[PDB]
């Protein structure tokens, strides 16, 4: 973990976000059980009958939050890892990772909590900023080593 000064901070933030995604998955299952809304007939028959194989708006919302996480957190896992080895200023790197972590946690809260628009959208944009920044820096480093 000491292979570069920014790496521990990256690994802390990334792993917290992976755990946060696992939390969303758990919540999704709990909502399916509570609302009796299952995607598979075999699940529905286990949990009350075939009429419970149905969509539910809260379940769909959970799925959207989880999908948005996959669209954003997964690229961060790649970009942040690579960026950690490019010798960025440690404090600047810390700020990139912290902005992403705070933005993404806020995003899930805003999504699952049904907060008014554009609160969720703002948190999405906020978290994308450090990702865009890291992507550009990686582009320059890669291009210049060709």
């Amino acid at each position: 973990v000491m292979s570069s000064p920014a790496l521990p901070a990256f690994l802390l933030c990334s792993t917290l976000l992976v755990i946060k995604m696992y939390v969303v998955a758990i919540i999704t299952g709990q909502v399916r059980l509570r609302k009796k809304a299952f995607a598979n007939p075999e699940d529905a028959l286990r949990h009350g009958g075939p009429q419970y194989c149905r969509s539910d708006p809260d379940v769909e919302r959970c799925l959207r939050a989880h999908r948005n996480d996959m669209e954003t957190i997964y690229p961060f896992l790649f970009l942040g890892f690579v960026y950690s080895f490019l010798g960025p200023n440690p404090f600047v790197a810390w700020m990139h990772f912290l902005v992403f972590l705070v933005g993404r946690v806020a995003h899930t809260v805003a999504y699952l909590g049904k907060l008014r628009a554009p609160i969720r959208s703002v948190t999405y944009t906020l978290a994308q900023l450090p990702c865009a920044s890291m992507a550009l820096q990686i582009l320059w480093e890669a291009a210049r080593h060709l």
Copy 2:
């Protein structure tokens, strides 16, 4: 690949799981063709007419299996890679990777094979256990190097 004793086992299991995901993608395409159920009008017109731009329960099932793979296998690719470099006991590491591999292969079999509930759900939980374990260990390593 010899940069840490656990790494070869990790790379074997991870790559098999990526290949397994590719298999799911291939199956999905085959089901679309067999059931004549396409997501795009251009595809439908190529394969029999506009009435074949339609949903199908078997196609939707394939998509759910593939999505669940992305929700679980992708985090494993990150966590298992990092975990491999934290000097875990080689046999303990092997068991983490093997439980994930077996659990995930079983999950796809249970999903696509339409096995009774909660067989699929149990395999999901089983495979998440080593991921949770690795995530916590990474958290501790990262936090302590801050």
Copy 3:
């Protein structure tokens, strides 16, 4: 970035593809706004009323393109990174990465541009070829170091 001769080319192609995914996300948002088709009631109420919480075929198409990217580009991020450290011929490695990059950019153009079938499908197959190749090579390297 100089830890292996193929790594800079990999990092260039991967980061361009991550940026390309961000472009798809931006396009998706623009289409939602233009077509007034939102997934969340809170979004719809901010942007004209509850009747705009609705599906739209162009939005759904954008989501499919983005999902297919996650199904293919994310595994490439893993496979290409590992493959870069296995000492492949630099030119051969370059060709693997370039075929994937060109295939995937073409895929998004074919998908969002609604090009006739099977143009999109061909680009998908084309880009999967270097991924399959890298996966097999990693399997052999991992297996032989067990």
